[PDB]
């Protein structure tokens, strides 16, 4: 019905009151729905904004549960899911929206609440409700860039957009270029990774992943998605693999973990963002900032660094011991199957953790500590830095250090698992004899990258700005389209089903030597995984880059961003090993890419390379079984700006 489309109007201009009229419509709000500020002049308003609209949406006056808790968070305050208190507020609001029987009462509850609670919080609470309420399925939620551009764009543009929109008539408006590589100069070598850390695409992917797999909400089934623990491990683990790749393409070494929390943090980061909702800017972190004990009475944070250290010490112990202990006192064993999944829930701290009280909230609390170095006891009445919000956390370099550490902890369980036997990763009969890649107008086994401007309408997000279009020009990494061509022999006499698993790693190390397996296995980034039917004899499989199951199409973002599928490489060319494996789909099958049910692969995530090598294996070229293939690829960057065409 219309109702579904009418809720989407709530996302329009989040700070403009709901009675101001969104798109080609306007809401006919009761007077008891007006805020205390505006209610005493309600007559002057409803009339003043009503016209020039094709529709007037009526809204029925309902009972409405107490909205005290939802309204506890200030309107001009920041909202983060990492802060203990906010979690309880959001989870309560989510509960209200979720608890509205009809799609009409959801519209009524929403319309009332919208102008009383924190915009950032509202957006989250609604987003979560719509996606998991049963009436509002298969919907198109507007990109959070378009509703909250302040979390994605240098604050400098805002006063240009205001100028352009006020001075120049519609149709003659110039697109606003969004600054790139703007957070640090060349004195900071970290500035080179702007195209990854600060890319709109990857920041959206991270935000959205945490939307669909929350770690604590209310009602366990929403949190309890198949293998979400392992997902949390793997997804974040791939972020760093990809980051470490991009590091090598900018003449840097692999990211160093946060060894220990007492030592200073070398790399500072000023994000250059200005929250229009908080009307303040996000604080920066200086070079050689030190983590400090938190005492944020308001936010309900009373945590010492030693608490964090204690959690880590215990988690390590469990991992080495090989088992954990639940609240009850019983032991649960970190086996080959569910071990990783358990560990994930323990480490991030999802309510699925078998003993939150003992093993703590290790990952999340780390995000808060790192974001509050500048004001840990709230004496300066300052908010958290960028690492305190999932939406912005990936912008900071320290993210990769903290997430690097966390990964090492997971590793110190994976290295305990028994090596995959020759048997276990052989497909009797199947043999892959070669894989290549081809781009139009480029040699074989060669990938190209470059810069590319794209346009986004940030009009819905620009509150109290003259209506019209406001196009912004993003510059971001892009790769030329390509396709894999895989030669597979059956030699069985029957149709064989198989999973094609494609990863890519660097060929050598930072010192220029052909990488060993122990090293290289951790640098393999997944590129594709798809099901294929093989006829007896010979099969030529072809797969386009845009068919990738790791990626989501550009149009959707505006899943990992498509333009970020290929590492940057170097102008002189960057050498890389492309790897493919065909596994026996009958074993890997899940009787029942992203998936809203169960995860469609029985094998562990990162399956060929998650575990250590079997004895005698030393490098990739002798790890291989017949049903695998390696290929030298060369990744060439070109510093030029292509259009979108």
Could you list the residues that contact its own copies (CB under 8 A)? 99-101, 134, 219-221, 322-323, 330-333, 335, 492-495, 536, 586-587, 589, 591-592, 596-598
Closest separation between CB of residue 494 and its own copies, Å?
Answer: 4
Look up residue 418 and give its DSSP letter: P
Decide whether 129 or 276 has the Cβ nearer to its own copies.
129
Closest separation between CB of residue 325 and its own copies, Å?
Answer: 10
- Gaps (C–N > 2.5 Å) in the chain: which residues precede them? 558, 592
- Neighbouring C-beta atoms of residue 171, cutoff 10 Å: 7
Closest separation between CB of residue 4 and its own copies, Å?
Answer: 17
Residues in the annotated binding site: 206, 210, 236, 363, 367, 403
Q: Concatenate the DSSP letters of all residues of 474-502 into one string.
A: EEEEEE---EEEEEEE--SSS-EEEEEEE
Decide whether 140 or 493 has the Cβ nearer to its own copies.
493
Closest separation between CB of residue 216 and its own copies, Å?
Answer: 16
Decide whether 536 or 573 has the Cβ nearer to its own copies.
536
End-to-end CA distance of the chain: 36
Residues in the annotated binding site for Cu(2+): 206, 210, 236, 363, 367, 403
Q: What string of H, E and C letters represents the secondary structure of 296-329?
A: ECCCCEEECHHHHHHHHHHHHHHHHHCEEECCCC
Apex 448 CA angle, 444 and 451, nearest 5 = 165
Q: The tokens of 126 are what?
A: 């609604």
Residues 332, 551: Cα–Cα separation, whole Å: 35
Beta-strand (E) ranges in 428-549?
Answer: 431-438, 446-457, 471-479, 483-489, 496-506, 525-534, 538-544
Decide whether 62 or 252 has the Cβ nearer to its own copies.
62
Residues tagged active-site: 348
Closest separation between CB of residue 337 and its own copies, Å?
Answer: 10
Closest separation between CB of residue 335 and its own copies, Å?
Answer: 7
Decide whether 413 or 507 has the Cβ nearer to its own copies.
413
593 with 501: CB under 8 angstroms? no
| Region of 464 on the Ramachandran plot (φ > 0 left; ψ -120 to 50 alpha; else beta) | left
Query: Which of 148, 136, 146 minimizes the C-alpha distance to 97?
Result: 136
Decide whether 384 or 585 has the Cβ nearer to its own copies.
585
Q: The tokens of 360 are what?
A: 């703590």
Residues 397, 511: Cα–Cα separation, whole Å: 23
């Amino acid at each position: 019905m219309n109702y579904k489309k009418n809720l989407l109007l709530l996302y329009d201009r989040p700070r403009e009151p709901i009675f101001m009229g969104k798109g080609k419509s306007v809401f006919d709000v009761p007077d008891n729905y007006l805020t205390d500020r505006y209610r005493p002049i309600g007559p002057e308003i409803q009339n003043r904004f009503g016209e020039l609209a094709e529709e007037r949406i009526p809204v029925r006056s309902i009972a409405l549960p107490d909205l005290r808790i939802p309204m506890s968070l200030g309107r001009q305050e920041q909202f983060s899911l990492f802060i203990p208190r906010h979690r309880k507020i959001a989870a309560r609001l989510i509960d209200i929206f979720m608890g509205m029987r009809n799609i009409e009462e959801l519209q009524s509850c929403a319309v009332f609440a919208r102008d009383r609670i924190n915009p950032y919080l509202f957006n989250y609470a609604l987003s979560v409700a719509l996606l998991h309420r049963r009436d509002t399925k298969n919907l198109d939620l507007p990109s959070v860039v378009e509703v909250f551009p302040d979390k994605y764009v240098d604050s400098r543009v805002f006063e240009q957009i205001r100028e352009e929109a006020t001075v120049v008539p519609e149709g003659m408006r110039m697109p606003i270029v969004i600054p790139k590589d703007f957070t640090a100069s060349d004195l900071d070598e970290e500035h080179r990774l702007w195209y990854f850390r600060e890319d709109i695409g990857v920041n959206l992917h991270h935000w959205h992943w945490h939307l669909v797999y929350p770690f604590e909400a209310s009602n366990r089934a929403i949190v309890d998605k198949d293998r979400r623990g392992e997902l949390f491990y793997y997804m974040h683990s791939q972020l760093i693999a990809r980051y470490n790749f991009e590091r090598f393409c900018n003449r840097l070494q692999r990211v160093k973990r946060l060894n220990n929390l007492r030592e200073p943090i070398a790399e500072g980061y000023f994000p250059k963002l200005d929250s229009l909702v908080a009307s303040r800017t996000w604080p920066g972190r200086v070079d050689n900032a030190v983590i400090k004990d938190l005492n944020r009475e308001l936010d309900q944070i009373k945590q010492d660094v030693s608490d964090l250290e204690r959690w880590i010490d215990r988690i390590y112990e469990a991992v080495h011991q090989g088992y954990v202990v639940d609240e009850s006192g019983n032991r649960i064993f970190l086996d080959e199957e569910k071990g990783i999944d358990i560990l994930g829930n323990i480490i991030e701290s999802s309510i699925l953790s078998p003993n939150r009280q003992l093993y703590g909230d290790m990952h999340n609390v780390g995000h808060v500590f790192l974001s509050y170095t500048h004001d840990p006891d709230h004496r300066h009445l300052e908010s958290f830095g960028v690492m305190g919000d999932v939406a912005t956390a990936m912008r900071d370099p320290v993210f990769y250090r903290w997430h690097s550490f966390i990964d090492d902890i997971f590793q110190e369980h994976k290295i305990k698992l028994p090596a995959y036997t020759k048997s276990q990763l052989t497909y009797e009969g199947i043999s892959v004899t070669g894989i290549i890649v081809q781009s139009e107008g480029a040699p074989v086994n060669t990938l190209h990258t470059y810069w590319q401007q794209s346009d986004v309408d940030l009009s819905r997000g620009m509150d109290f700005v003259p209506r019209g279009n406001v196009f912004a020009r993003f510059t971001h990494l892009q790769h030329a389209p390509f396709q894999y061509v895989i030669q597979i022999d059956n030699t069985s006499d029957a149709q064989r089903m198989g999973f094609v698993r494609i990863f890519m790693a660097p060929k050598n190390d930072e010192r220029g030597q052909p990488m060993l397996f122990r090293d290289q296995r951790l640098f393999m980034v997944e590129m594709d995984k798809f099901l294929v039917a093989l006829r007896p004899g010979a099969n030529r499989i072809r797969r386009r880059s845009n068919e990738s199951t790791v990626t989501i199409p550009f149009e959707r973002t505006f899943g990992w961003p498509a333009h970020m599928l290929v590492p940057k490489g170097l102008p002189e060319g960057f050498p890389a090993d492309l790897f493919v494996m065909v596994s026996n789909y009958e074993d890997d099958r899940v009787v029942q890419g992203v998936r809203d049910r169960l995860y469609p692969d029985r094998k562990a995530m990162g399956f060929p390379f998650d575990r250590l090598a079997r004895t005698g294996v030393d490098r990739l070229s002798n790890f291989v079984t017949p049903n695998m293939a390696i290929q030298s690829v060369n990744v060439i960057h070109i510093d030029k700006t292509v259009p979108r065409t």
